[PDB]
Amino acid sequence: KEGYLMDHEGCKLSCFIRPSGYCGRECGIKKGSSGYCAWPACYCYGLPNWVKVWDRATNKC
């Protein structure tokens, strides 16, 4: 499963001026196999089907 990662508030996880690899690390903690900065937010690939990703409808911020 792929999608943008959300932070603790349901916002997209920013990667503005973050080091390269930051999104891969954050996707990896959530059990994703790959991630990249889809500037300005992190995008993950390989997440199990049960992990929740960002959605336009209940997006806040």
Domain count, the chain: 1
Give the determination technique.
Answer: X-ray
58: left (phi over 0), alpha (psi -120 to 50) or beta: alpha
How many CA atoms are closer than 13 Å to the CA of 6, on its beta-carbon side? Answer: 14
Cα Rg of the chain, angstroms:
11
Compute the half-sphere exposure of residue 2: CA atoms within 13 Å on the CB side of its CA. Answer: 11
Chain center to CA of 36: 8
- DSSP-derived secondary structure letter, 58: T
- Read out DSSP for 1-34? --EE-B-TTS-B-B-TT--TTHHHHHHHHTT-SE
Q: What is the CATH number of the domain that holds 18?
A: 3.30.30.10
Instruction: Show the domain range for 37.
Output: 1-61
